[PDB]
Ligand binder design. Structure first.
Ligand SMILES: CON(C)Cc1ccc(O)c2c1C[C@H]1C[C@H]3[C@H](N(C)C)C(O)=C(C(N)=O)C(=O)[C@@]3(O)C(O)=C1C2=O
Ligand SMILES: [Mg+2]
Ligand SMILES: [Mg+2]
Ligand SMILES: [Mg+2]
Ligand SMILES: [Mg+2]
Ligand SMILES: [Mg+2]
Ligand SMILES: [Mg+2]
Ligand SMILES: [Mg+2]
Ligand SMILES: [Mg+2]
Ligand SMILES: [Mg+2]
Ligand SMILES: [Mg+2]
Ligand SMILES: [Mg+2]
Ligand SMILES: [Mg+2]
Ligand SMILES: [Mg+2]
Ligand SMILES: [Mg+2]
Ligand SMILES: [Mg+2]
Ligand SMILES: [Mg+2]
Ligand SMILES: [Mg+2]
Ligand SMILES: [Mg+2]
Ligand SMILES: [Mg+2]
Ligand SMILES: [Mg+2]
Ligand SMILES: [Mg+2]
Ligand SMILES: [Mg+2]
Ligand SMILES: [Mg+2]
Ligand SMILES: [Mg+2]
Ligand SMILES: [Mg+2]
Ligand SMILES: [Mg+2]
Ligand SMILES: [Mg+2]
Ligand SMILES: [Mg+2]
Ligand SMILES: [Mg+2]
Ligand SMILES: [Mg+2]
Ligand SMILES: [Mg+2]
Ligand SMILES: [Mg+2]
Ligand SMILES: [Mg+2]
Ligand SMILES: [Mg+2]
Ligand SMILES: [Mg+2]
Ligand SMILES: [Mg+2]
Ligand SMILES: [Mg+2]
Ligand SMILES: [Mg+2]
Ligand SMILES: [Mg+2]
Ligand SMILES: [Mg+2]
Lengths: 206, 155
RNA sequence: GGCUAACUACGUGCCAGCAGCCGCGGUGAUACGUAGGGUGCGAGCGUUGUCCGGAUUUAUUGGGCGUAAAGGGCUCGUAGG
RNA sequence: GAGAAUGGAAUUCCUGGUGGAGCGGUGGAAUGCGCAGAUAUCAGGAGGAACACCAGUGGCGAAGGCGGUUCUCUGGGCCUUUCCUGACGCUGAGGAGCGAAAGCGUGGGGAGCGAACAGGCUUAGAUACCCUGGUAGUCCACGCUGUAAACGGUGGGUACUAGGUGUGGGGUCCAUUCCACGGGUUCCGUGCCGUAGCUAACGCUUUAAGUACCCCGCCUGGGGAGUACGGCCGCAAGGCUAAAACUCAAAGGAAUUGACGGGGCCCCGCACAAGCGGCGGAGCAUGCGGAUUAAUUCGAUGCAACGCGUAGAACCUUACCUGGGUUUGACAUGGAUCGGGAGUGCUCAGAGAUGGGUGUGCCUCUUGGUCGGUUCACAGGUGGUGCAUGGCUGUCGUCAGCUCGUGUCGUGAGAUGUUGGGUUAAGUCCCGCAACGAGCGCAACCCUUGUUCACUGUUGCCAGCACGUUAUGGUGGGGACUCAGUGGAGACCGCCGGGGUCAACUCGGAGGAAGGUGGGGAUGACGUCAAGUCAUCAUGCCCCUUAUGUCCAGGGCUUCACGCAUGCUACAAUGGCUGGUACAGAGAGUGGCGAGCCUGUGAGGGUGAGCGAAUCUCGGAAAGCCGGUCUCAGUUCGGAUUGGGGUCUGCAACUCGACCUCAUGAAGUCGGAGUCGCUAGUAAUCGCAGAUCAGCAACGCUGCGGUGAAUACGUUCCCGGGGC
RNA sequence: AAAAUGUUUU
RNA sequence: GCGGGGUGGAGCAGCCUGGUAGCUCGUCGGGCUCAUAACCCGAAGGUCGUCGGUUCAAAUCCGGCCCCCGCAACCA
């Protein structure tokens, strides 16, 4: 209601932009194609689990880094799915796409995949308290210095909306040098959708 | 304020007449942030003063300020169900400020055409002992004397 | 619905109605109406009436009286204990 | 306790002396009293009532209660070693007596006080509080009444069960006295603390609410109701005894945590105060309510809606209205099926949508890209619900807080930590502490500004050197200065002195560009308001489907008896007009910024370099200074309105654009009650730039620099908040 | 120094 | 029959006599308040029951009428 996005707050200070290109007469159209690419990838690769999509451009050539928990879905069988998604990318944009897919070393520590999993459990109708506790425990088993999860909505299929949250460790949202990874997802249930937000304090950075 | 007495900005001296009084006068005229206009007015008034009398304009301004300086003035007090007018002695800085404010306001209220020698006329009249500024000083002193019975409420 | 063994869908929309108490119905009704499913009983099953129990809620077994209901305004003194 | 006499002060009244204008009373007043001499002051007198000091932390009484002194009469208590009687004790239904004050009866008395009452004030009213008067009553005698929060809300008697410590009464003992000071000890009171124990807790605890025994009174949910009926008592008021119908599902006890308080203590904020400038009046701009309309689309409604979504409504936007079209649809995705063009140029009809012409007409390949229909699936919705939601935001609030783990306390909610003392902008620290710790907030890390160093030197800069058309750092060149932008340094109460038990902090000083957080921004804890948004997006459910979809033209969102709100320009001389002349910053630019020249009164037009920009352009900064002029005039102020002639953008300026020019010259004389902003480069004012944008109703918004104040004693009051 | 009040949502 | 009364929304002044229609409350518009009441600041509001006459001029003077009151309506 009144809290800033941690990633935007720390943008330029500790964290970096997801897109790296320069253009001053096409800026809008490159932004539009980037939006198309990201929407297409998110809409067609939910199963893999997308941590981030990172876009680079050199000269009419686009490079897409896809940070995914399980790139097995993206690569398919012997790269067939990778080739088909690349081909759909040329079909969508019209430019030469070089697509590479990267792992996440600690999916239980990356907040975006944590929100992915919590929302998936909520959609599969798992008790939200149990799901949040499992995610929290897994994060601290991995070794994060602080977890904070908040699920808001018609939790448990109820009528009134709740804002149930869990946290322990330390999550200094106000500290800029604090490396805080923020993830968000929406569990699509038979009763609207639940917003799941996750903050994970990786540690302190210069 | 609650915390304590806020610091006062030091008063500069007038380059021409070498007196902080004239600088305070121009800073009191000082409408709209036009320092140059205000001190053009003030210098014109002081030169008119030295024209109409041989004595020094800074000295005549000083004499006017002493003739307009109030010694005590009454303030509202909320004791009981009725308001009182408690007379309070006035410190030298406060009384110089009051004299300057009254001088400037009544100069602005004078009937003559231009502000410069409206202020000049008011200054000369005050130095002599006449004018609206001196009348207001006498009236405030008179009302303080009338309400002198509440000098024991001072804190 | 809970006490109380056994739950969902459809219809209705503080209406129609339910209820022993708490309460339910105001558009997602496990509480109304129907259906499927279930549970308790079974030539019976429920409801009403009445009595005892739970009620130590008249306490002999087995309670209490400063503030929760409860020490007489105070003493003298008769029967009684 | 009863009776009688009696003492002094004070009030009131009376008489006299003196003296003269008020007195009295309150928050402020008035009623009232007073020159017919009050109030005040002194003397003398009368009368009624209550007894300062002693006097409480105390004494006595069965309770109610009891305070001048003296005498008379009288009740009970306490102690004592001997003495006497020898269980004669305890309690006590019914009964009887006593029983504050108010009240009643007969008579007396009546100073003060004072229900009722009268008047004055306050008030919306004031049958009240407050003020001036004032009768019963208060007093006495004899009766009556018989009730009180008549309470220790605790019946009487008895025995037992740690202490500690005040105090009242009687003995007795001791040392020095041969008093008494003192200590003990014993018996009886009366308080406080406190163990065991008890209690729901609060608390009680040898004066039990503990452990026990004896007797009495009494309770059985809350109301109805201590009411009705009956009876008894009373002169009366009323008292005593004492139900039922009906009705509710609670009523209640103690305590916990919050919130609130016209509760306290301590604090803070432009919250007041001290100041400066406004708003509310006028004209216009803009938003909204209302009204109106075919439509005046929808959302926002105390602060925290109202120059807000709108960072741009002539068409478009557009969601609204009239009317004209369309139906797998304006747009998606997938199967089939007939295909080769799709898609378009020119024309015709039409307000346009659209429809009809005419030209042009796939690339692979024998089975794709692309489209067509017919369907089939399906799409579409700014339609509903922000009280089904996600997301995002306001807000209390930059407020100093909000919690957790473990321990501990309590039956429990819960508490402790987080209270206390000091300090701080701060739950910031310090000291002590049944707490020991941690977390989110505070702070810091980030951006910007203030000083400085190194590095680099163009498109920036020009100190020393060489020319330049006269001229322009224009030129070669230069790392000095400025600046640009990367990386460092710098501030930490770090140093010195005082205060501070110390300790945190605090005061002063030096150094320094900067000193005690240096200025500003970003950052908004747990949560609150079912706060806003289904209309940015997303979405549960519901609703529309030849229409609530969708296309188009025109209209509307711009209405106008009105009301509010935010602004702008003013009301003039610190000003208007006019000529000259200085000094910025931050920004924008290729359908763009446009110089220069020519043309026009001007908006502009015509040509048109340069610049994707530290280069070129926007560009002029304005206020200011200087010269002239106007001379207090509803004006040479003000620039609304209205008439004429235009320019530009755009398919198109009627509704409904900006601008130019000519003429016109409205209200307005500083604005009622009320109200707003601001503590320093701030307020006040002055111009400039950008977003959106063809153009612009922009005076809005977000920034930028120029000029540049007054004041803050202080926390009493108003508003908001913080700790206990 | 006096200074009142706060219907019925679902 | 005698005498009085009829004036904004209400209740009341203006009547010897002609010329200027007032106070209180209420209505309406704005403040104060979270909101209402109260209070604060501004505004509208009756051509005087009706007909006619007097007069330069009528709420005012005179008459008729309508309405509301009061009084009287008596002696056998
Ligand atoms: C009416 O339906 N029933 C009766 C209840 C109701 C039901 C559903 C709703 O969704 C809302 C409401 C009440 C309204 C009241 C609104 C009002 N406001 C519009 C001025 C207001 O007075 C405040 C406020 N000052 O705080 C609010 O709270 C408010 O805005 C709000 O949230 C509301 C709702 O939306
Ligand atoms: Mg069961
Ligand atoms: Mg249903
Ligand atoms: Mg029984
Ligand atoms: Mg029973
Ligand atoms: Mg019991
Ligand atoms: Mg007992
Ligand atoms: Mg009781
Ligand atoms: Mg008793
Ligand atoms: Mg009795
Ligand atoms: Mg006996
Ligand atoms: Mg007697
Ligand atoms: Mg005393
Ligand atoms: Mg005592
Ligand atoms: Mg014997
Ligand atoms: Mg009796
Ligand atoms: Mg009596
Ligand atoms: Mg009597
Ligand atoms: Mg009598
Ligand atoms: Mg009285
Ligand atoms: Mg008593
Ligand atoms: Mg009792
Ligand atoms: Mg007894
Ligand atoms: Mg006993
Ligand atoms: Mg004792
Ligand atoms: Mg007890
Ligand atoms: Mg009775
Ligand atoms: Mg209580
Ligand atoms: Mg002020
Ligand atoms: Mg105005
Ligand atoms: Mg509207
Ligand atoms: Mg809507
Ligand atoms: Mg809401
Ligand atoms: Mg709404
Ligand atoms: Mg901070
Ligand atoms: Mg709401
Ligand atoms: Mg919708
Ligand atoms: Mg509009
Ligand atoms: Mg550019
Ligand atoms: Mg400040
Ligand atoms: Mg007769």
């Amino acid at each position: 209601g009144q809290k800033i996005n941690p990633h935007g707050f720390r943008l330029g200070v500790t964290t970096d932009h997801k897109t790296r290109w320069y253009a001053e007469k096409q800026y809008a159209e490159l932004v539009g194609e980037d939006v198309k690419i990201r929407e297409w990838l998110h809409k067609n690769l939910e199963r893999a689990g997308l941590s981030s999509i990172e876009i680079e451009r050199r000269s009419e050539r686009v490079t897409i880094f896809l940070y995914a928990a399980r790139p097995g879905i993206v690569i398919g069988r012997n790269g067939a799915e990778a080739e088909r998604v690349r081909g759909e990318l040329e079909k969508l944009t019209g430019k030469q796409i070089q697509l590479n897919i990267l792992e996440v070393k600690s999916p239980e520590t990356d907040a975006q995949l944590v929100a992915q999993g919590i929302a998936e459990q909520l959609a599969a109708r798992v008790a939200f308290r149990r799901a949040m506790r499992k995610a929290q425990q897994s994060a601290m088993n991995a070794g994060a210095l602080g977890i904070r999860i908040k699920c808001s909505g018609r939790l448990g299929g109820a009528e009134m909306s709740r804002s149930e949250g869990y946290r322990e460790g330390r999550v200094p949202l106000h500290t800029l040098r604090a490396d805080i990874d923020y993830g968000f997802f929406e569990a699509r249930t038979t009763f609207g959708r639940i917003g799941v937000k996750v903050w994970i304090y990786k540690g302190d950075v210069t | 304020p609650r915390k304590g007495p806020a610091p006062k900005r030091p008063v500069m001296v007038d380059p021409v007449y070498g007196s902080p009084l004239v600088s305070q006068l121009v800073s009191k005229i000082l409408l709209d942030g036009k320092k140059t206009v205000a001190q053009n007015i003030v210098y014109t008034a002081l030169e008119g003063c030295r024209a109409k009398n041989n004595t020094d304009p800074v000295q005549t301004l000083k004499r006017a300020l002493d003739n307009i300086k109030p010694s005590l003035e009454v303030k509202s007090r909320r004791v009981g169900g009725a308001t009182y007018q408690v007379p309070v002695e006035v410190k030298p800085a406060r009384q110089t400020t009051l004299a300057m404010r009254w001088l400037v306001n009544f100069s602005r209220e004078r009937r003559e055409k231009t502000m410069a020698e409206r202020l000049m006329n008011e200054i000369l009249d005050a130095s002599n002992g006449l004018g609206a500024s001196v009348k207001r000083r006498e009236d405030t002193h008179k009302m303080a004397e009338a309400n002198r019975a509440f000098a024991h409420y001072r804190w």
